[model samples]
Target: KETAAAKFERQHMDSSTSAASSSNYCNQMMKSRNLTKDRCKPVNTFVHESLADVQAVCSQKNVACKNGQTNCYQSYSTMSITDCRETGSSKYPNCAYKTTQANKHIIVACEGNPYVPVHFDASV
Candidate 1:
C-alpha cells in the first residue's frame, strides 16, 4: 500500500495546479535545507496531524457566526467572554470591544454560561 508520504509526493510532483504548487514549494524548501527522505516524511505527517488537531479544537469551540444569527435560525446572541475592547477609531473617538472571530456561522452559546452572540462581519 502507498504511504501518506508517497501519496503527498506523487500528487505534488505530478501536478501543476495551485495545490501542487504548494507541494512544490515545500519540496524545494526541503531540498534547500538538505533534508533527507526520512526528514521529508515527518513534514507531511506533522502537517496532517497538526491540521487535524486544530480542526478538532475548532469543532469543540463555538462556531463563528456572521451578522448576529445562529444556525438554528434563532435571532439575537451575545458572548460572555469578550475578546478585546475596541479603542477609538482613527477619525472618531469611540470604544468598542469587538468579537475576535467573524465571517462564518458558529455556535456562540455552546460553552459555560452561554449567552446570545452579537454577530457582525469583521473581516481582516
Candidate 2:
C-alpha cells in the first residue's frame, strides 16, 4: 500500500510526465475546487488533513459500533485458482500455488432490538 505522503508527493509533483500520476489526480479533483493547476498546496493540504482525520478515528480503540452491526471494520480472505505453471513453463511444470491477502468490509446490517450486536474482530 502507498503511504499517504507518497500519494501526496506523486499528486503534487513530477508534472504528470513521469511515473507519478498524482499530479493528474490533483488536476482533475482540484479543478472544480478552483485550485491552482500543478500546485502542491491544495492537493497536499487536503491529503494531510484527510489522513489526520482518518488517523484520529482509527486511534480511538474502543469506538462503539452503532446501528446494530453498522459502522464496523472487517477483514476476510477468499480463495481462487489460477494456472501459474502453464505447459510451456518449467518452474512447476503443471502446478500452481495459493495466496491470500486482507479483504476489508463494513457491516451493513440493522434490525430489531433483540438482535444483539456482536464484536467480530476478536472472534474472527
Candidate 3:
C-alpha cells in the first residue's frame, strides 16, 4: 500500500530539473507520472526542492486551506516549481497541458501524527 508520504513523492517531488525549457514537460510528465490514467488532473505542481526542505514546511506559518481547513502551511522561502494546467482543448486519453515554471512560496496541507505535507494547495 502506498502511504501519503510516498504518494506525495510520486505526484509532487521533482528535484532534478529546476526549470523546464519546453512546454512538453507537463505533457510528458503528467503521462509518465501516471496522473493522466483515468482523467486529466486539472491542475498540478511539481516541486524542485529537496524532500527534507519540503517536509520542513510543516513547521512554517499556518494558513487556511482552499477548502477552509486549518492544516495548511506556507513556505517561508521561494522554491522552484512547475505548474501543470490542463489545456482547454484537451480530451481524455489525450491530456495536454500548459507547463510554466517559477520560483514561489508554496502552500501545502499537512496531516498525520508526524505532521507532514499531504496535499499541495497552491504556490504564490
Candidate 4:
C-alpha cells in the first residue's frame, strides 16, 4: 500500500532534472507515473528540489488548502517546478499535456506524524 507521503513524492518529486526535455514530457510522465490509467489528471506539478527541501515546507506557512483545510502550507522559498496541463486534444487513456516551467512559491497539504506533504495544492 502506498502511504500519502510516498504517493506525493512519486507524483511530484523530480530532483534529478530542472527542466523537461520536450512538450511530450507530460504525455510521457503522466502515463509512466500511472496518472492516466482511468483518465487524464488534467493538471499536475513536479518539483525539482530535493524531497527534504519540499518536506520542510510543512513548517513554513500554515494556510488553507484548495479544499479549505488548514493543514496546508505555502513554501517560503520559490522553487523550480514544471507544470503540466492537459492539452485540448487530450483523450482518456491517451492523455496529452503542455509543460510550463517556472519558479514559484508552492502550496501543499501535509499530514501524519512526521508532517509531510500529501497533495499539490497550488502555486503563485
Candidate 5:
C-alpha cells in the first residue's frame, strides 16, 4: 500500500511543468494521476516545486484545516501551483477541468512520525 506522503507526491507534485500552459493540463493530469475515477474531483492543486520544498512546508507554520483539524500547516513562501477545477457541466467518465496558475502559500495536512504532508488542504 502507498503511504500518504507517497500518495501526495503522486497526486500533487509536478516539478517538471513550469505552469499550466494548456487548458487541458488539468483534464489530462486529473485523469492520468487517477484522481478522476468514480467521480471528478471538483478541485485539486499541483505544486510546481521540488518534493523537498513541499515537504519542508510541514515545519513552516501550523494552521487549522478547513474542517477544523489541527494537523494542517501553511507554507511560509508563495509557491508556483496550478489549480484544477471541474467545470459545472462536467460529467463522470468525461470530466472537464479549468486550469489556473498562481503563486500562493499552500496549506496541507501533515501526519506520521516524520510529520510530512499527507493531504493538500488548500492554497492561499
Candidate 6:
C-alpha cells in the first residue's frame, strides 16, 4: 500500500503531457490509472503541476472540507487542470469521459507527518 500523498499523486497528478490536444486522455488515463476497472469513476480532475508545487498547499491556509472538516486548503494560486467527466455516452466497460480544461484555485486535504497533500477536494 501507499501513503495518502502517493495515492493523491497517482490519482490526480498530470504534469508531463497535460497541454496536448488529446480529448482521448480520459479513456486512456482512467484505465491506465486503475480508476475504471469495475465501475467507471464518475468524475475526476488532473492537476497540471509539479508534485512539489501541489504539496505546498498543505502548509498554506486551512479551510473547511466539503463535509465541513477542517482538513482542506484552498490553493494560493490558480493552476491548470483537466476535468474528466462521465457522459451519457459512457458505458461501464468503455468508461467514456469528457475532458474540460481550466485554471482555478485548487482545494485539497492534507496530513502532517511531512505536511503534504492527500486529497483533491475541489478547484474554484
TM-score of 1: 0.17
Each prediction's whole-model lDDT (CA): 0.27, 0.27, 0.91, 0.89, 0.93, 0.86
* Local accuracy of candidate 4 as per-residue lDDT tens digits, 1-124: 9999989988898888877666877778888888888779999998989899999999999998888789999999999998999989988877889998899999999999998999999998
Give the candidate number with the greatest lDDT. 5
Which portions of model 5 show Cα errors greater than 4 Å?
Answer: none
Query: Of the candidates numbered 1 and 3, which has the greater TM-score value?
Result: 3
Ordering by TM-score: 4, 5, 3, 6, 2, 1
Candidate 5 per-residue lDDT, tens place, 17-81, comes to 77778698999999999999978989989999988999999999999999998999999999999
TM-score of each: 0.17, 0.18, 0.94, 0.95, 0.95, 0.93
How does model 2 fare in lDDT? 0.27
Candidate 1, residue 106: how far the Cα is off, in Å: 12
Question: Which of 4 and 6 is the better model by lDDT?
Answer: 4
Clash count list over all predictions = 11, 2, 0, 0, 0, 0
Report residue 22 deviation for candidate 6 (angstroms): 2.4
Q: What is the lDDT of residue 12 in candidate 5?
A: 93
lDDT of 1 by residue, 1-124 (tens): 9543343333222222212223234334334433333333222111112222222322344434464433212212221111222323411122222223212222322111222222222211
